[PDB]
Amino acid sequence: PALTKSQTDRLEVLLNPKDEKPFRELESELLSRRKKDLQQIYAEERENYLGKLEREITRFFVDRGFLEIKSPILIPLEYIERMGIDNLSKQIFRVDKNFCLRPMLAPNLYNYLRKLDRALPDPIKIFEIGPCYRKESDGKEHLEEFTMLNFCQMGSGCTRENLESIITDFLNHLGIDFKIVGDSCMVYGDTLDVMHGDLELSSAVVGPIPLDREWGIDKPWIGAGFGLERLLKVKHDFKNIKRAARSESYYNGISTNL
Amino acid sequence: PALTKSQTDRLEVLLNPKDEKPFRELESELLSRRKKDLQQIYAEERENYLGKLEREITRFFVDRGFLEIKSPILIPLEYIERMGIDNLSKQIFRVDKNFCLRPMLAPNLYNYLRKLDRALPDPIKIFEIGPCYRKESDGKEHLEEFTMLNFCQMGSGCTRENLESIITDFLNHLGIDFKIVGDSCMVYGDTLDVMHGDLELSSAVVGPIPLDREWGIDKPWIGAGFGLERLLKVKHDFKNIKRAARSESYYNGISTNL
Numbered sequence: 001p002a003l004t005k006s007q008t009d010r011l012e013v014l015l016n017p018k019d020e021k022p023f024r025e026l027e028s029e030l031l032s033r034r035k036k037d038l039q040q041i042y043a044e045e046r047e048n049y050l051g052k053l054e055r056e057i058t059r060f061f062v063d064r065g066f067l068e069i070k071s072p073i074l075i076p077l078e079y080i081e082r083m084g085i086d087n088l089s090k091q092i093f094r095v096d097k098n099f100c101l102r103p104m105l106a107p108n109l110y111n112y113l114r115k116l117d118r119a120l121p122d123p124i125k126i127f128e129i130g131p132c133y134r135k136e137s138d139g140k141e142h143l144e145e146f147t148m149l150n151f152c153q154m155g156s157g158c159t160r161e162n163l164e165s166i167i168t169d170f171l172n173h174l175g176i177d178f179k180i181v182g183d184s185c186m187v188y189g190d191t192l193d194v195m196h197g198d199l200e201l202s203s204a205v206v207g208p209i210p211l212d213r214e215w216g217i218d219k220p221w222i223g224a225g226f227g228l229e230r231l232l233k234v235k236h237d238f239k240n241i242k243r244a245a246r247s248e249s250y251y252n253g254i255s256t257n258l
Numbered sequence: 259p260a261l262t263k264s265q266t267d268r269l270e271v272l273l274n275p276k277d278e279k280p281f282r283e284l285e286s287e288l289l290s291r292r293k294k295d296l297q298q299i300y301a302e303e304r305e306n307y308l309g310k311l312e313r314e315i316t317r318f319f320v321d322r323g324f325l326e327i328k329s330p331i332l333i334p335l336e337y338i339e340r341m342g343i344d345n346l347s348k349q350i351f352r353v354d355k356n357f358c359l360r361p362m363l364a365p366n367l368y369n370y371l372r373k374l375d376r377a378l379p380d381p382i383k384i385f386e387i388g389p390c391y392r393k394e395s396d397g398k399e400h401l402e403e404f405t406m407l408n409f410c411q412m413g414s415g416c417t418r419e420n421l422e423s424i425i426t427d428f429l430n431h432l433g434i435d436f437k438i439v440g441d442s443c444m445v446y447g448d449t450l451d452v453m454h455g456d457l458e459l460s461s462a463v464v465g466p467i468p469l470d471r472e473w474g475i476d477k478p479w480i481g482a483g484f485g486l487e488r489l490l491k492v493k494h495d496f497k498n499i500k501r502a503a504r505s506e507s508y509y510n511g512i513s514t515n516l
């Protein structure tokens with residue numbers, strides 16, 4: 001008669017946002033739908049949502065004058081201290097005695113900004129997309145392995161207005177609803193946070209900040225960091241961010257346990 | 259008069275493969291050339307070689323009927339044992355008590371092959387591109403953080419001839435010279451190795467192998483794994499694989515220390 005909590009949980013795994021007693025028939029129907037969804041992907045486009053979003057974001061920023069960076073994921077532990085992360089400090093995945101999995105893209109991008117200032121014309125515009133890692137207790141809006149986009153500009157035109165304009169163009173391009181709000185944190189400021197309801201899509205900063213001196217930066221700058229899995233969650237109306245992650249359990253938000 | 263070893267080393271950092279006393283003038287010339295190279299990239303294409311190669315490889319395999327996978331980089335340690343890696347075992351970067359950085363894409367792809375067999379028509383064709391990690395003593399042809407491509411097919415048409423044909427089409431597409439040779443290893447076989455001179459570009463396997471049973475696989479299959487940094491090294495004639503890596507020291511093989 002009434003579905004159990006465990007049965008409802010099983011059906012929820014197989015339910016997709018656009019879907020509109022006995023359990024076995026409900027399960028059979030959804031299994032059929034999800035198999036057909038995977039079959040359609042396989043027959044036609046064959047692209048993974050996370051990969052495809054990375055490619056779309058890459059095109060957006062390249063076309064707008066930003067240099068594509070691919071920097072190390074395993075970074076020196078000293079970069080954490082140098083970012084002012086003292087006792088986030090408890091969220092770091094340490095590897096060996098001298099390295100960690102990067103929890104953010106900032107330190108590598110600081111180094112690129114400094115180095116490229118010796119070669120490139122003002123303003124210097126760069127971005128990176130790639131894996132980042134944090135130990136998290138939360139499951140709904142957080143992953144321990146996620147994908148960040150960070151873009152930044154240094155030199156001329158590094159105004160709050162320009163930053164808000166890039167953010168607005170970017171999210172209107174992707175078709176993601178948002179509002180920009182004031183907030184603060186230990187590492188940076190004073191940030192602008194880009195929100196979708198109560199979900200943070202991005203934290204953005206208008207420099208300079210005193211942290212810059214440690215990285216050999218003495219020019220104005222602006223930048224923002226976005227989680228790609230959060231963008232996908234909002235775009236595809238996933239109830240849990242696990243549907244948007246690098247995963248063996250979901251493919252393009254479709255359960256692989258069929 | 260004569261350049262010192264240290265001076266020659268400095269000039270070699272700034273020398274690019276296509277380049278054709280006192281040290282200060284030689285250094286000044288090369289600095290100028292390398293700055294202009296970065297300026298040209300920034301003015302025109304703005305793509306990173308590693309990112310661009312990933313995108314090109316993605317297009318090749320998608321167009322040939324392979325499903326794009328994005329699976330976890332941090333994987334359970336049990337996957338290592340289950341791959342038959344017992345005491346490579348000393349090359350694994352362990353994280354926490356239960357996880358490691360994946361040294362290869364095989365285990366995740368085995369799981370995808372098994373899972374997708376319940377949904378997709380025969381043959382099942384999949385590929386993944388992404389970071390892999392191994393502790394290495396060698397610096398010239400090895401990185402500790404590298405990027406793998408692995409493709410595989412399971413079911414019908416899983417012949418050595420078909421495998422060699424995919425490999426041949428792929429490398430002729432990229433414009434990379436190669437020969438396919440017989441070899442062997444502890445994990446798989448009996449492999450075919452794809453060589454560029456004495457450099458291994460890929461190891462390839464024609465299944466079934468007895469390892470399959472552990473992963474719930476009982477069908478014929480073929481697959482190959484390629485290092486993207488090795489492909490770039492060969493394509494761009496880099497003397498050291500560090501020029502092709504995720505790096506803060508090189509961008510598209512150009513020194514960032516200018």
Ligand SMILES: Nc1ncnc2c1ncn2[C@@H]1O[C@H](COP(=O)(O)OP(=O)(O)NP(=O)(O)O)[C@@H](O)[C@H]1O
Binds near residue numbers: 226
């Ligand atoms: N654990 C995570 N899982 C998924 N996305 C994340 C995670 N941590 C950060 N992000 C994304 O990266 C962006 C910038 O990083 P940051 O501002 O450091 O995150 P944060 O303030 O810790 N987010 P939250 O923990 O929800 O308050 C965030 O706005 C998110 O979109």
Ligand SMILES: Nc1ncnc2c1ncn2[C@@H]1O[C@H](COP(=O)(O)OP(=O)(O)NP(=O)(O)O)[C@@H](O)[C@H]1O
Binds near residue numbers: 392399401483484
């Ligand atoms: N440390 C590394 N750095 C760069 N590429 C690598 C590394 N290890 C493996 N690869 C690439 O991944 C491919 C398949 O992996 P695998 O066959 O396990 O490597 P391998 O036999 O250990 N190579 P080698 O150590 O040179 O004999 C290789 O053919 C390389 O192109």
Ligand SMILES: [Mg+2]
């Ligand atoms: Mg957080």
Ligand SMILES: [Mg+2]
Binds near residue numbers: 185193202
């Ligand atoms: Mg924040």
Ligand SMILES: [Mg+2]
């Ligand atoms: Mg090896």
Ligand SMILES: [Mg+2]
Binds near residue numbers: 451460
């Ligand atoms: Mg090999």
